[PDB]
Amino acid sequence: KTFTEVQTERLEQADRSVLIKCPSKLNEKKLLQYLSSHGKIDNYFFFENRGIHALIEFSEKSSVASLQAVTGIPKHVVPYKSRLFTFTLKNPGSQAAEERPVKISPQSHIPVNELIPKLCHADSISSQMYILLNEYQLTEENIKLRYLACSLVRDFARAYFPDSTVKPFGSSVNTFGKLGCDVDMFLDFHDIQKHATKMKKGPFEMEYQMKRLPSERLATQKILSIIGDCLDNFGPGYSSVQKILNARCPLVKFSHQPTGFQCDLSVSNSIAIRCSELLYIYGCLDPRVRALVFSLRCWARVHGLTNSVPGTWITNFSLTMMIMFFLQKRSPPIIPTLDQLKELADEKDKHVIGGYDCSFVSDLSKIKPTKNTETLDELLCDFFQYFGNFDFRKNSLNLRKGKEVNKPESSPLYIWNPFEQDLNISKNVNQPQLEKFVAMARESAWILQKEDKTQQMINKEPWGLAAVLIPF
Amino acid sequence: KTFTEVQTERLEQADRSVLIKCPSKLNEKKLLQYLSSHGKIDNYFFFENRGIHALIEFSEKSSVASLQAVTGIPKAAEHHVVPYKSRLFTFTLKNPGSQAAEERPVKISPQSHIPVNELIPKLCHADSISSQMYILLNEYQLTEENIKLRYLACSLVRDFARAYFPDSTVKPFGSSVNTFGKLGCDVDMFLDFHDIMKKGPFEMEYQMKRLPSERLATQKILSIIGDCLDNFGPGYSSVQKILNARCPLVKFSHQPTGFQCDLSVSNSIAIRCSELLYIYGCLDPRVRALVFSLRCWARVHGLTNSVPGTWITNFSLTMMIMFFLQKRSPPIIPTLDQLKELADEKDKHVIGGYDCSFVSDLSKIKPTKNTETLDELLCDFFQYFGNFDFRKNSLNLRKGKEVNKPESSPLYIWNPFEQDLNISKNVNQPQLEKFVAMARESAWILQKEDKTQQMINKEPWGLAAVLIPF
Ligand SMILES: [Cl-]
Ligand SMILES: [Cl-]
Ligand SMILES: [Cl-]
Ligand SMILES: [Cl-]
């Protein structure tokens, strides 16, 4: 039910899953028939990534060890044994060419130039936005692949750090991730002995000889450094390992070839996890939330408002928060404020970080459904109108209050960090970039207000969402 | 027990051993009583190294995992440690106010030998040169406890390598295992880390990352282990990575044991050399007595040094001593070719095309009929090399003969396991001449002294007379 319960279930399924690089001439039935001899298979799919790969989700974890028991070491290699397998035929020239294999599950979304025609063939702006959402959103197969990537990194980390867990956060889990997005991973340490340890009969407290480091930051940097070097030199399918240990949140970036994901590994950050669960709640509350976010992120990218590299540009996160604020301010609100979510929280949902109460309700059924019935056609235009006429000089965005309030500090765009006091999430944004955003918003509002959609359809020209998803 | 069988047994015992940093107020009985609840303990001892530490050797390996299952990270330590779990434990009292046993002193096992200034008086009170040399040997040689500690150090380093090379081994060589090591000597360690089912309709293999060329692989693996030694455990390690040397090397101080260590990738020739020396050391007690005394002599007179350079090495010196013993009438030890001829098929070892075989079973070697005393052998060693023609002759330990020098080098000692290689190529003419001068002077001192009067006069005599600066 809850965000935490979804993560637990996803990780358990990943724990009994494996990846297989398939033979050039793949017979699906023969492969599955063989794998089923090691135990029942709950789920599986194929994907393309420099050849065909299969994700296999066994019903029982024991099946993994069963398969590993008949798997050999190639024959010079780093003999780290994993859940990455390569299957080939003994006598490849004695099997014929295969007629109709296999269904491929896409791990990327269609490019904008292919999307636009689909949008133009839609009946309304609402339908356009749902088409975009369906084309872009993470698939069940992609999600399974993301959790398996985390599970594999966990196993790699567990060689030196047996209590390691690796769990995804951000776009991979908050409902706003699009196909192709990075897998952001958090490493944490928790006792694998989940069972109830007795009262020991002896007199001693017993610990490992470990250096007590002055800061959590230094420990984090040393741990990530070793894991990074090990992935680089010893880990199968890990490439382009970049150590970015001196960043605000120390980080190791890498490309995971078996899955084709770009990944980012850091040590667990409690604030970042609260943020992911908050966005998950908002995304789950109403489908218009996700529809708006996906369309507006695409809009921002198309018009050069967002960028892949950090700088003076508004970030996708900042933009997403602006959208949440917009939705909080509808009459009636489409989503509750963070203070409203805090007040619905019981003792079990108490989360205090750095002295600041970051509590909010985890049970979605405790949130009264919105009575707002505005269509996406209205909301898209109104978003552009609202921020196109928003006084950014005088007002800041407070998502806890759901109100425009005086700016604590002078900054072009001030959006309050909802889990840290006196922090602006959009402090990076300069006046030029903010003015560009405003100009694009106003132009987009005008285009939607003035267009004759029926004639554009007849004239075979872009209309509605498509009209604002092309350069001006 | 062959050399190989000794190593195997030692490593197996180290594999089921742990190190425990003991409570400030240590009750030995309570500690052992508690630890025995995880399984029987075959051996244990205590040593001093910034507080009391205990080596615990469990009867069963399973006991290690049992102890680890109740070992925890403090709440205050969370997020502030590198969570590498090891066989290094710290024990403290749950309630410091719950001591309810009589306090007894704990026996400390020494890991160092007495300094020369304390040794000399003991030598001067001996009855003969032979007795002096056996006193030195007994004061200096590795103890059973020290040996266990050395193998455990290797075992701990092995566990770092095994994270991604599960079949890895780390084994000591050189002075730690060849019978000629003295307390306080480095632990020289070799890593061997790579190249060590039902049939379905698919061939099935793991996806594994390729290693680079042997040297590059060696450099990367040693670099990571060096980083582990830095960051895993209590640390304070003084890790020196010397990865660009001819033989890539990591030097470090292992704080839990207090050993100075050198880690490199396994060299098959160096291992044969260690077993050869082990054979020679085991054959006759005079072999070890001579080597220990002469190594001490070399150090005292500045002929050997802790850092590599133009100095004769302890290994080269030891080989010179072996050559000397091969040349006695009759020989005290056999030549390497004699040991080769005694080898059966099971003792076959060919390295780089060169037959490095020799007998491993010591009972197959006929005991020496030489009955020369150490008094004679010590003086004769100095006399022999003091008059040896180093310009014209080289030392061949396979033949047990002086032979023409293959290449021009001040001191030429044939590498017994590699063709056309001089183990003492590093030695320059100045250092060789110093050695010769010291040898000749030492011979004269022993030849001319009146030992009875020196004893009465309370002056150094015999071995003591050559173990002080000239
Ligand atoms: Cl194949
Ligand atoms: Cl997030
Ligand atoms: Cl996008
Ligand atoms: Cl040796």
Beta carbons within 8 Å of B461's beta carbon, 6+ residues apart:
B124, B449, B451, B454, B455
* Cα gap B35→A204, rounded to integer Å: 10
* Cα gap B314→B311, rounded to integer Å: 9
* Cβ contact B80–A205 (<8 Å): no
- The residue written with tokens 């509750």 in the block is A336
Closest CA to B158 of B29, B8, B263, B243: B263
Contact B89, B18 (CB under 8 A): yes
**Could you give the count of Cα atoms lying within 13 Å of B349 in the half-sphere of its Cβ?**
19
Stretch 163-202 of chain A: residues touching chain B, C-beta under 8 Å: 163-164, 189, 191, 193, 197, 200-202
Ligand in nearest proximity to the CA of A91: 1
Which residues partner with B354 through β-bridges? Answer: B351
Stretch 52-71 of chain A: residues touching chain B, C-beta under 8 Å: 67, 69-71
Which of A68, A86, A89, A210 best tests the B interface by mutation, with the highest count of B CBs <10 A? A210
| Elucidated via | X-ray
Closest CA to A257 of A24, A36, A82: A82
Contact B361, B2 (CB under 8 A): yes
* Cα gap B289→A222, rounded to integer Å: 48
Beta carbons within 8 Å of B443's beta carbon, 6+ residues apart:
B379, B382, B383, B386
Ligand 2 center–CA A172 separation, angstroms: 9
**For residue B334, cis peptide bond before it (omega within 30 degrees of 0):** no
Ligand 4 center–CA B276 separation, angstroms: 8
Q: How far is CA A341 from CA A336, A344, A352, A361, B265, in A?
A: 7, 5, 15, 5, 60
Sign of CA dihedral A433, A439, A445, A451: negative
- The residue written with tokens 């005991």 in the block is B367
CA A165 to chain centre: 17
Residue type at position B330? P
Determine the distance in angstroms separating the CA of B9 from the nearest CA of chain A, rounded to an integer: 26
Q: Name every chain A residue with its beta carbon within 8 A of the beta carbon of B33.
A: 202
Determine the distance in angstroms separating the CA of A239 from the nearest CA of chain B, rounded to an integer: 10
Contact B250, B222 (CB under 8 A): yes
Ramachandran region, residue A372 (left: φ > 0; alpha: ψ -120 to 50; beta: rest): beta
Contact B390, B411 (CB under 8 A): yes
* Cα gap A390→A445, rounded to integer Å: 13
Maximal CA-CA distance, chain A: 87
The CA angle B75-B79-B83, to the nearest 5 degrees, is 90
DSSP per-residue string spanning B166-207: TT-EEEEEGGGTSS--BTT--EEEEEE-S------SSEEEE-
Contact B84, B235 (CB under 8 A): no
Burial of residue A293 (CB within 10 Å: 0-12, 13-18, 19+) is buried
* Cα gap A337→B420, rounded to integer Å: 84
**Could you give the count of Cα atoms lying within 13 Å of A197 in the half-sphere of its Cβ?**
13
* Cα gap A412→A432, rounded to integer Å: 9
Q: How many other C-beta atoms are found inside a 10 Å radius of the C-beta of residue A52? A: 18
Q: Which of A85, A197, A230 sits opposite B204 (nearest CB)?
A: A85
- Give yes or no for A162 touching B (CB within 8 A): yes
Task: State how beta strands A238-244 and A251-256 pair.
Answer: antiparallel
* Cα gap B435→A412, rounded to integer Å: 81
Stretch 304-363 of chain A: residues touching chain B, C-beta under 8 Å: none
* Cβ contact B82–A209 (<8 Å): no
Ligand in nearest proximity to the CA of B181: 4
Q: How far is CA A187 from CA A90, A217, B72, B163, in A?
A: 40, 13, 19, 18
3-state secondary structure of A200: coil
* Cβ contact A234–B73 (<8 Å): no
CA B15 to chain centre: 19
Q: How far is CA A203 from CA A199, A430, B26, B52, B464, in A?
A: 11, 62, 11, 18, 52
Residue type at position B15? D
Q: What is the CA radius of gyration of chain B?
A: 25
Residue type at position B31? L
Ligand 1 center–CA A34 separation, angstroms: 15
H helix or E strand, kind and range, residue B119: helix B116-124
φ and ψ at residue B161, rounded to 5 degrees? -65, -30
Q: Which of B30, B81, B203 sits opposite A210 (nearest CB)?
A: B81
Beta carbons within 8 Å of A328's beta carbon, 6+ residues apart:
A334, A335, A336, A337, A399, A402
Which residues partner with B96 through β-bridges? Answer: none
* Cα gap A456→B173, rounded to integer Å: 84
Q: How far is CA A205 from CA A51, B23, B71, in A?
A: 54, 10, 8
CA B65 to chain centre: 29
Both structure tokens of B158 = 């092995």
* Cβ contact B82–A201 (<8 Å): no
Closest CA to B156 of B237, B92, B217, B267: B237
DSSP per-residue string spanning B214-243: HHHHHHHHHHHHHHHHHHSSS-----EEET
Q: How far is CA A444 from CA A321, A428, A439, in A?
A: 20, 24, 8
Q: Name every chain A residue with its beta carbon within 8 A of the beta carbon of B79.
A: 216, 219
Q: How far is CA A464 from CA A113, A125, A326, A333, A363, in A?
A: 16, 5, 20, 24, 36
The neighbourhood of ligand 3, an ion, using CB within 5 A, equals A 297-298, 301
Residue type at position B394? S
* Cα gap A233→A227, rounded to integer Å: 10
Contact A73, B205 (CB under 8 A): yes
- Give yes or no for A80 touching B (CB within 8 A): yes
* Cα gap A146→A151, rounded to integer Å: 9
Number of domains chain A contains: 1
Header resolution in angstroms: 1.8
Both structure tokens of B20 = 């425990």
Q: Name every chain A residue with its beta carbon within 8 A of the beta carbon of B166.
A: 79-81
Which residues partner with B91 through β-bridges? Answer: A206
Contact B303, B345 (CB under 8 A): no
Q: How many other C-beta atoms are found inside a 10 Å radius of the C-beta of residue B136? A: 26
Q: How many other C-beta atoms are found inside a 10 Å radius of the C-beta of residue A318? A: 20
H helix or E strand, kind and range, residue A187: strand A183-189
Sign of CA dihedral A191, A195, A199, A200: negative
Which of B82, B160, B192, B219 best tests the A interface by mutation, with the highest count of A CBs <10 A? B82
* Cα gap B307→A153, rounded to integer Å: 43
φ and ψ at residue B372, rounded to 5 degrees? -60, 140
Closest CA to A326 of A391, A393, A274, A403: A403
Ligand 2 center–CA A314 separation, angstroms: 16
φ and ψ at residue B245, rounded to 5 degrees? -70, 165
* Cα gap B197→B199, rounded to integer Å: 6
Ligand 3 center–CA B462 separation, angstroms: 90
DSSP per-residue string spanning B369-390: -----HHHHHHHHHHHHHS--T
Sign of CA dihedral B197, B202, B208, B209: positive
CA B132 to chain centre: 23
3-state secondary structure of A321: helix
Maximal CA-CA distance, chain B: 90
* Cα gap A259→B417, rounded to integer Å: 50
- Give yes or no for B34 touching A (CB within 8 A): yes
Buried b / exposed e over B253-286, threshold 16 CB at 10 Å, is: ebbbbbbbbbbbbbeebbbbbbbbbbbbbbbbeb
Q: How many other C-beta atoms are found inside a 10 Å radius of the C-beta of residue B445? A: 18
Ligand 2 center–CA A112 separation, angstroms: 25
* Cα gap B231→A346, rounded to integer Å: 42
CA B70 to chain centre: 35
Beta carbons within 8 Å of B6's beta carbon, 6+ residues apart:
B177
Which residues partner with A165 through β-bridges? Answer: A188
Q: Which residue of A has its CA nearest to B76?
A: A212
* Cα gap A250→A416, rounded to integer Å: 23
Ligand in nearest proximity to the CA of A132: 3
DSSP per-residue string spanning A98-138: -SS--PBPP-SPPPHHHHHHHHHTSSSHHHHHHHHHHHHBP
Both structure tokens of A274 = 């609260």
- Give yes or no for A25 touching B (CB within 8 A): no
* Cα gap A152→A92, rounded to integer Å: 30
Beta carbons within 8 Å of B224's beta carbon, 6+ residues apart:
A226, A229, A230, A233
Contact B254, B237 (CB under 8 A): yes
Q: How far is CA B15 from CA A148, A214, B186, in A?
A: 34, 33, 21
Ramachandran region, residue A260 (left: φ > 0; alpha: ψ -120 to 50; beta: rest): left
* Cβ contact A34–B201 (<8 Å): yes
* Cα gap B333→B344, rounded to integer Å: 20
Q: Which long-range contacts (CB under 8 A, 24 or more apart) does A468-471 make?
A: A468/A299, A468/A384, A468/A444, A469/A112, A469/A115, A469/A116, A469/A119, A469/A295, A469/A298, A469/A299, A469/A302, A470/A116, A470/A302, A471/A302, A471/A303
- Give yes or no for A76 touching B (CB within 8 A): yes
φ and ψ at residue A301, rounded to 5 degrees? -65, -50
- The residue written with tokens 């080098």 in the block is B409
Beta carbons within 8 Å of B316's beta carbon, 6+ residues apart:
B411, B413, B423, B424, B427
Q: Which residue of B has its CA nearest to A26?
A: B202
Determine the distance in angstroms separating the CA of B291 from the nearest CA of chain A, rounded to an integer: 39
The CA angle B16-B22-B25, to the nearest 5 degrees, is 150
* Cα gap B258→B269, rounded to integer Å: 28
- Give yes or no for B32 touching A (CB within 8 A): no
Beta carbons within 8 Å of B136's beta carbon, 6+ residues apart:
B119, B123, B289, B292, B293, B296, B463
* Cα gap B213→B265, rounded to integer Å: 14
Closest CA to B311 of B295, B324, B327: B295
Q: Where are the beta strands (DSSP E) in A49-89?
A: 52-58, 84-88
Burial of residue A157 (CB within 10 Å: 0-12, 13-18, 19+) is buried
Closest CA to B230 of A217, A235, A215, A225: A225
Burial of residue A410 (CB within 10 Å: 0-12, 13-18, 19+) is exposed
Both structure tokens of A75 = 């024959």
* Cα gap A294→A383, rounded to integer Å: 13
Closest CA to A246 of A220, A268, A272, A273: A220
Q: Name every chain A residue with its beta carbon within 8 A of the beta carbon of B86.
A: 208-209
- Give yes or no for A226 touching B (CB within 8 A): yes
Residue list for the binding site of A for UTP: 171, 174, 275, 316-317
Both structure tokens of B281 = 């050391």
* Cα gap A383→A392, rounded to integer Å: 15
Ligand in nearest proximity to the CA of A299: 3
The CA angle B7-B12-B15, to the nearest 5 degrees, is 125
Q: Which long-range contacts (CB under 8 A, 24 or more apart) does B338-346 make?
A: B339/B276, B339/B279, B339/B365, B340/B398
- The residue written with tokens 């010591």 in the block is B362
- Provide the residue range defining the domain that includes B412: 1-470
First to last CA, chain A: 44
Contact B358, B342 (CB under 8 A): yes
- The residue written with tokens 């010179």 in the block is B320
- The residue written with tokens 């190594």 in the block is B295
Q: How far is CA A436 from CA A147, A443, B62, in A?
A: 38, 11, 67
* Cβ contact B202–A21 (<8 Å): no
Which of A152, A206, A225, A267 best tests the B interface by mutation, with the highest count of B CBs <10 A? A206
Contact A256, A263 (CB under 8 A): yes
Contact B33, B74 (CB under 8 A): no
Ligand in nearest proximity to the CA of A186: 2
Determine the distance in angstroms separating the CA of B362 from the nearest CA of chain A, rounded to an integer: 38
- A vs B: CB pairs below 8 A: 217
Beta carbons within 8 Å of B294's beta carbon, 6+ residues apart:
B317, B321, B378, B381
Whether residue B130 is annotated as binding a ligand: the answer is no
